[PDB]
């Protein structure tokens, strides 16, 4: 296994923040999450797709990373980059953001 997250990072209100994650096995789809809500999906065969709850302020970042624009005090919390791989299974990583 391999779990290499960006770490517990912080940014100011109004600005933007980049969420990085790095994984040995074929990556089928990477799911981004704001605590329990789904932020985005990066499917290997179908590409990047943003949730209707975040199309207005979330754009695909570099590689399999994400960019959360127009920050607010409510965006503080856990963030998860789920890696659904084959045959290794699912690998998850945690990232805490403060604002």
């Amino acid at each position, epitope marked *: 296994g391999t779990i290499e997250t960006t770490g517990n990072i912080s940014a100011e209100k109004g600005g933007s923040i980049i969420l990085q994650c790095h994984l040995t096995a074929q990556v*089928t*789809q990477v*799911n981004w999450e704001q605590q329990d*809500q*789904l932020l985005a*999906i990066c*499917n290997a065969d*179908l590409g*990047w*797709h*943003i*949730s*209707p*709850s975040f*199309k*207005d302020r979330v754009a695909p970042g570099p590689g399999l990373g994400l960019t959360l624009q127009s920050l607010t005090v409510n965006d503080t919390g856990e963030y998860f980059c*789920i890696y*659904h791989t084959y045959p290794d299974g*699912t690998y998850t990583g945690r990232i805490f953001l403060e604002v």
Partner: antibody
Amino acid sequence: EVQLQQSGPGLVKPSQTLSLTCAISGDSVSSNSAAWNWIRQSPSRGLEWLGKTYYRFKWYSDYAVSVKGRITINPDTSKNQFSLQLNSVTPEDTAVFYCTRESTTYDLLAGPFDYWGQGTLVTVSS
Amino acid sequence: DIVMTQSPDSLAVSLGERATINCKSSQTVLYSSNNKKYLAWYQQKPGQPPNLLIYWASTRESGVPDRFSGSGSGTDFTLTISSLQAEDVAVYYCQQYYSTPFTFGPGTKVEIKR
């Protein structure tokens, strides 16, 4: 084509819970190209989205702010159906409740409601 | 939330004549990355659920006749019926599927002048 059959009682006493089911035929509940939504309609509020359940590589749920804390939409993979549970029902919840399929083929997280159930008239009265 | 509005509350048109109904979103439903308008049109006949007519602002759904068509873009949308038939009498709604919550317009009742 996809067929959606609705079931569950229409009459609900105030404060008690409304529970309806939407049985699917012609598609799966865990489909990556679909989301399973509940919409309501009344002459006072028109058409209003209530919530949805979708499985991409994990089960997810998104609900309207006007019902968060009362609403629950859970799938059943073995029975190929999705439920609606509205707790603490008030006379304002009286509406025709429709279950519908959101066709998310091009954009996997967004699409129009291409198929709808017959509708269930829900009356809130003692 | 995106508020959807429809300019004609009701419209009465003679049999075989054109009927155009307008729709407007408070924000643009055009997503740049794929150049798609997240807007749909529905027809609801009395006592039955709404039927999808158009999606992506201009794409006709399978099985819906050629007389129904969608145009307009970004924020202002227009559903047209080139020749209104007797069976086309219904309330027609527009909806945005761009941001949560997905919202519908107030509806436009299309009726026949005879």
